[PDB]
């Protein structure tokens, strides 16, 4: 018999490469468009007594 000779050891994987950056994350807009309006009308009442 003979002793097994040294095995090839695992290596540390390269690792992940990361790009630094700034981000803005946008979602679907669900907010209604809002604006200002002015109503001009006249309450007309006719009473029969």
């Amino acid at each position: 018999v003979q002793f097994e000779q040294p095995r090839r050891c695992p290596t540390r994987p390269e690792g992940q490469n990361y790009t630094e950056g700034i981000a803005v994350v946008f979602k679907e807009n669900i907010a209604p468009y809002k604006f200002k309006a002015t109503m001009y009308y006249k309450d007309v009442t006719v009473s029969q007594v």
């Binding site: 003979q2 097994e4 669900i30």
Partner: protein, 48 residues
């Protein structure tokens, strides 16, 4: 005569240890009810 190492039986002094990496996992979006379903669960919609 000479001979190859493969001609001699091999016994190991090494202790085995088998480590495997945790594989990648992808999480998909998943909701029980969407907003459309929640809004549609009303019987009358005042706006409509």
């Amino acid at each position: 005569h000479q001979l190859s190492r493969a001609d001699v039986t091999t016994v190991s002094t090494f202790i085995d240890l088998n480590i495997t990496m945790l594989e990648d996992h992808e999480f998909v979006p998943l909701e029980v009810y969407t907003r459309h379903e929640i809004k549609d669960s009303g019987l009358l919609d005042y706006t409509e």
